[PDB]
C-alpha cells in the first residue's frame, strides 16, 4: 500500500506531528464544559455563522448513545470520522455486554484508536480534541477530554480551542463549589465563562445539557438570551 | 475406502505413590492378526521427573512424542527451567484439542513427580480432557486392569480392610502380576514389559519378559 512512516521522532525527543497537530486544535473554535453534580452542561462558542443560512448541519455537539455526549475542536472532518467509528463501537459494545456503555470505555477507545493511528504506516494524525461527557451508572457525572496524542484525561472543567489559557484562567479564579450548587447557576456559569470568551452575542452560543436521567436537550436561543440578560443584571448588581 | 486410522493396541499402566510414579507398558506393536515386532517400548523419558506413555495409533504416538519434546526444549530455552508435570498436562491438553476436527486416536498417560515430591498421574482421552488420578490403565487391556487396581490400590468394595499406604516393591509385584494376568486373556499384551520408575533421584528402568505367545 503506502509503506512509509510519516511520523519520525525528532532529534531532541519529539513527535513532530503529534505536538504540531495540536496547533490545528489551537486554531479552531472554542468550547467549554463543566459538570455540576446532577446536571451536566457543555457548549461550544464561535460558530461564526453567516447569520442568514441553515444551522442544523453545522452542529458541533452530537451523541453516540442515549447516555454519552460529544464536543470537539480542531478540524471537523476528522471529528466526523472519529464519531462514526465511536458510534459503531458503542453500539457493538451494547451487542455484547447488556449495560449502557460506560464513558470511560468510549474514551479509551477513542484515545486507543488515535494512538494506533499515529503509530501506523503513513496515516496523518488526527488534529482534533474531543470532549466526552456522560454520566454512567448510579448517576455519576464525569467528563474526559482527548488529545492528538491519545491521552484520555479526566478534568472538572474545560479549556480547549482558541485562547484556552484565558478561559482556564477565568475558571481558575472561578472554581467555586457554590457555582455547582444550583443547576441554573451551573448553566449561567458556562454562559459567564463563554462570555469571558469571544463576542458572545448570543448567536454563536450553542449549548446543550443533560440531566443524567434523560437525553441531550439543545436549547432554543431565547432561553440563552434571558440567561445572558440575567447575567448582565447580576453584573450590574455587582456595582 | 482408504481408512486413515488403524488400531495398533498396547497397554499402559501407571501408579502414583507417596514419592514415586511407576509407569509400565508392553512392547508389542501389532496390526490386525499379525505381529510387526516384539520390541517397541511405549514409555518415553521427557524430563528428569516425567515419563509419558502413548498407545493407540502408532504414528500419532511418535508424532506427539516428538512435538512434546520440542515444546519442552522451547520452554527450557525461554524460561531457564524445566516444566512441571501439570504444565505439561495443560500443554498436552491444548495440543490434543488443537487437532479436534481431525482427532488423534491416542490414549495418553503422564506419570511423574510434582514439585512437592509426590506422585501424580494425569490421564487423558483422545480429544483432550485430563484429571489427576492415582492410577490408570490405558489401551486395549484397560477393562482387564482397572477393577483389580480398584481392589488392591483403591481398596474399594471391601469390608474391614484397612488402608495401608502403597509401598514400592508391593507396587512392583502388583505390576508384574497384573501384566501376567492380563497377558493370559489379551491378544495385544507383549512379551517385554518395560517398567519405568521415577523417584526423587532419577529414572530407573527394568525389563521383565513374559510368556512368548
Amino acid at each position: 500500500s503506502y509503506d512509509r512512516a510519516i511520523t519520525v521522532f525528532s532529534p531532541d525527543g519529539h513527535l513532530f506531528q503529534v505536538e504540531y497537530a495540536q496547533e490545528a486544535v489551537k486554531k479552531g473554535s472554542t468550547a467549554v464544559g463543566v459538570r455540576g453534580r446532577d446536571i451536566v452542561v457543555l457548549g461550544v462558542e464561535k460558530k461564526s455563522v453567516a447569520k442568514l443560512q441553515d444551522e442544523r448541519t453545522v452542529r458541533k455537539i452530537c451523541a453516540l448513545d442515549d447516555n454519552v455526549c460529544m464536543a470537539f475542536a480542531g478540524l471537523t472532518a476528522d471529528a466526523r470520522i472519529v464519531i462514526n467509528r465511536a458510534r459503531v463501537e458503542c453500539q457493538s459494545h451494547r451487542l455484547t455486554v447488556e449495560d449502557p456503555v460506560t464513558v470511560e470505555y468510549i474514551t479509551r477507545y477513542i484515545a486507543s484508536l488515535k494512538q494506533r493511528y499515529t503509530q501506523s504506516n503513513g496515516r496523518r494524525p488526527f488534529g482534533i480534541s474531543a470532549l466526552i461527557v456522560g454520566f454512567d451508572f448510579d448517576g455519576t457525572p464525569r467528563l474526559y477530554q482527548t488529545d492528538p496524542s491519545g491521552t484520555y484525561h479526566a478534568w472538572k472543567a474545560n479549556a480547549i480551542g482558541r485562547g484556552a489559557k484565558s478561559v482556564r484562567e477565568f475558571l481558575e479564579k472561578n472554581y467555586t463549589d457554590e457555582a455547582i450548587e444550583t443547576d441554573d447557576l451551573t448553566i449561567k456559569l458556562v454562559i459567564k465563562a463563554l462570555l469571558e470568551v469571544v463576542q458572545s452575542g448570543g448567536k454563536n452560543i450553542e449549548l446543550a445539557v443533560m440531566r443524567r436521567d434523560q437525553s441531550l436537550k439543545i436549547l432554543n436561543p431565547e432561553e440563552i438570551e434571558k440567561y445572558v440578560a440575567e447575567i448582565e443584571k447580576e453584573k450590574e448588581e455587582n456595582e | 475406502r482408504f481408512s486413515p486410522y488403524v488400531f495398533n493396541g498396547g497397554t499402559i499402566l501407571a501408579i502414583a505413590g507417596e514419592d514415586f510414579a511407576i509407569v509400565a507398558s508392553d512392547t508389542r506393536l501389532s496390526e490386525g492378526f499379525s505381529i510387526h515386532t516384539r520390541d517397541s517400548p511405549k514409555c518415553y523419558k521427557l524430563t528428569d521427573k516425567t515419563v509419558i506413555g502413548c498407545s493407540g495409533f502408532h504414528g500419532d504416538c511418535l508424532t506427539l512424542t516428538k512435538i512434546i519434546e520440542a515444546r519442552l526444549k522451547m520452554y527450557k530455552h525461554s524460561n531457564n527451567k524445566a516444566m512441571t508435570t501439570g504444565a505439561i498436562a495443560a500443554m498436552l491438553s491444548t495440543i490434543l484439542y488443537s487437532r479436534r476436527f481431525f482427532p488423534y486416536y491416542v490414549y495418553n498417560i503422564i506419570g511423574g513427580l510434582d514439585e512437592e515430591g509426590k506422585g501424580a498421574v494425569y490421564s487423558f482421552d483422545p480429544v483432550g480432557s485430563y484429571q489427576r488420578d492415582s492410577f490408570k490403565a490405558g489401551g486395549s487391556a484397560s477393562a482387564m486392569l482397572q477393577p483389580l487396581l480398584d481392589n488392591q490400590v483403591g481398596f474399594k468394595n471391601m469390608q474391614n480392610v484397612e488402608h495401608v499406604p502403597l509401598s514400592l516393591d508391593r507396587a512392583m509385584r502388583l505390576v508384574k502380576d497384573v501384566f501376567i494376568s492380563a497377558a493370559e486373556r489379551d491378544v495385544y499384551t507383549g512379551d517385554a514389559l518395560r517398567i519405568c520408575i521415577v523417584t526423587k533421584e532419577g529414572i530407573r528402568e527394568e525389563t521383565v519378559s513374559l510368556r512368548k505367545d
Partner: protein
C-alpha cells in the same frame, strides 16, 4: 535533510532509537527499589491544573495479580504494550497453569520493542519499570525503547534520574526493609519534584510474598507522608 528511518550512524548506533532515548528524558520521574521483603515502587504524577482531576492519571498500572509496572513520558504507547503484555501473561497461565515470570514477560515485550518498519512504524517512546514476586523472590526489572533489557536493584528513570541514581546509591544497601525504602524513595521524590509534596502528587505500589497483591489505596499515603 530526511534520510531513511532505519539508518545506522556514522559512529554506529542508529538514529531513531537514540532519539527515543532522548525522548524519555522529558517525562516524569519514577523510582522502584528491590527489597527482599518485597518490591516497592514510586512515581510522580505531575499535576498541572486544578481543573485536572488528580485520581485519573495512571502511572502504576496492573499487569498480573502479582506483576506490577510503571510508565513514563508518552502515556499511550505504554498503554498498548501494557495491554499486550497482559494478554501474553494470560496466554502463559492458560497454556501452562502457572505464572509467567517477570523476565519472561519482559522478553515477550522486548521481542517487539523494535519491530518498527515499513513492511510486515516508529520506535516506541516509553521507559518501563517492572516488578513483582516470582519464584526467584522479588524482582525489579527495567527495559528501554532499544529492547536492551537488564535487571536493576533500584533504578530511577526519566527527567531526574541523575541525582536520583546518585542519591539513591548513597542510601541503598542490600539488607533494607520495606517502609524504610518507601520513605527513602519519597524523600528523593520531594527533592526532585517541583510542587509541594502532598496527598495528591505521588502514588506507591508495593508487592510482597506476604502482602500477596500490589494494593495501595489512598490515605495510607497520608499516614506515610505525615511520618516525614
Amino acid at each position: 535533510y530526511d534520510r531513511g528511518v532505519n539508518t545506522f550512524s556514522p559512529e554506529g548506533r542508529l538514529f531513531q532509537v537514540e532519539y527515543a532515548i532522548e525522548a524519555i528524558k522529558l517525562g516524569s520521574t519514577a523510582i522502584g527499589i528491590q527489597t527482599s521483603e518485597g518490591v516497592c515502587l514510586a512515581v510522580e504524577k505531575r499535576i498541572t491544573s486544578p481543573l485536572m482531576e488528580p485520581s485519573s492519571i495512571e502511572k502504576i498500572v496492573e499487569i498480573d495479580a502479582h506483576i506490577g509496572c510503571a510508565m513514563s513520558g508518552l502515556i499511550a504507547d505504554a498503554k498498548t504494550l501494557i495491554d499486550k503484555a497482559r494478554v501474553e501473561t494470560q496466554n502463559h497461565w492458560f497454556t501452562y497453569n502457572e505464572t509467567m515470570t517477570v523476565e519472561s514477560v519482559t522478553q515477550a515485550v522486548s521481542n517487539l520493542a523494535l519491530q518498527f518498519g515499513e513492511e510486515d512504524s516508529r520506535p516506541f517512546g516509553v521507559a518501563l519499570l517492572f516488578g513483582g514476586v516470582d519464584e526467584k523472590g522479588p524482582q525489579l526489572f527495567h527495559m528501554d525503547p532499544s529492547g536492551t533489557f537488564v535487571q536493576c536493584d533500584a533504578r530511577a528513570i526519566g527527567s531526574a534520574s541523575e541525582g536520583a541514581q546518585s542519591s539513591l546509591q548513597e542510601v541503598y544497601h542490600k539488607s533494607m526493609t520495606l517502609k524504610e525504602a518507601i520513605k527513602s524513595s519519597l524523600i528523593i521524590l520531594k527533592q526532585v519534584m517541583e510542587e509541594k509534596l502532598n496527598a495528591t502528587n505521588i502514588e506507591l505500589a508495593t508487592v510482597q510474598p506476604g502482602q500477596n497483591f500490589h494494593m495501595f489505596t489512598k490515605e495510607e499515603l497520608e499516614e506515610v507522608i505525615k511520618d516525614i
